[PDB]
Amino acid sequence: KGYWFELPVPALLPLPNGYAIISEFGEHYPRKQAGNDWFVVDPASVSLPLRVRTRRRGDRMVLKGTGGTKKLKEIFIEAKIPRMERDRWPIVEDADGRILWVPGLKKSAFEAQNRGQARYILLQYQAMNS
């Protein structure tokens, strides 16, 4: 039940788990309240293209601030995610394999800060329900 996508931008990318990832370019840094279902990337500071793929064992990501490095498995357990939905859960990495974001669950230190960059990549994670 595994998958792997190169993530174009702009794009709306339906996923085998019933969710979609939407990408687009934006000039401005987001103002919305912090949440795990959106993400901001600075193209200049991360290796493109982005990919979205399912988990492998050993997968770890570096948390914001002094959070430290955290194994993805631990994140799924703490979130009480059913074993079947984790095997199917999108993981957003850069072209180098750095895990940037686990949509809906956790952000890495690699999320853009508001630093006067000319342009950002904006990501959104949303269900195909209603």
Nearest distance in Å: CB 63, Cl ion: 8
Of 11-30, binders to Cl ion (CB under 5 A) are 30
CA distances from 125 to 25, 34, 108, 130 (A): 15, 14, 16, 14
The residue number with the shortest CB distance to Cl ion is 32
Rounded (5°) CA angle 86-23-40: 80
Nearest distance in Å: CB 33, Cl ion: 5
Stretch that binds Cl ion, among 2-10, 31-39, 52-60, 93-101 (CB under 5 A): 31-39
Is 104 a binding residue for Cl ion by CB under 5 A? The answer is no
CB 13 within 8 A of CB 5: yes
The token pair that represents 82 in the structure block: 């059913």
> 42 vs 126, which CB is nearer to Cl ion?
42
Kindly determine how many residues on this chain lie close enough to bind Cl ion according to the rule CB under 5 A.
7
Report strand pairing: 91-93 vs 4-7. Answer: unpaired
> 30 vs 43, which CB is nearer to Cl ion?
30
The rounded distance, in Å, linking the Cα atoms of 36 and 107 is 7
> 20 vs 104, which CB is nearer to Cl ion?
104
The rounded distance, in Å, linking the Cα atoms of 81 and 77 is 6
Contacting positions for Cl ion (CB under 5 A): 30-33, 42, 112-113
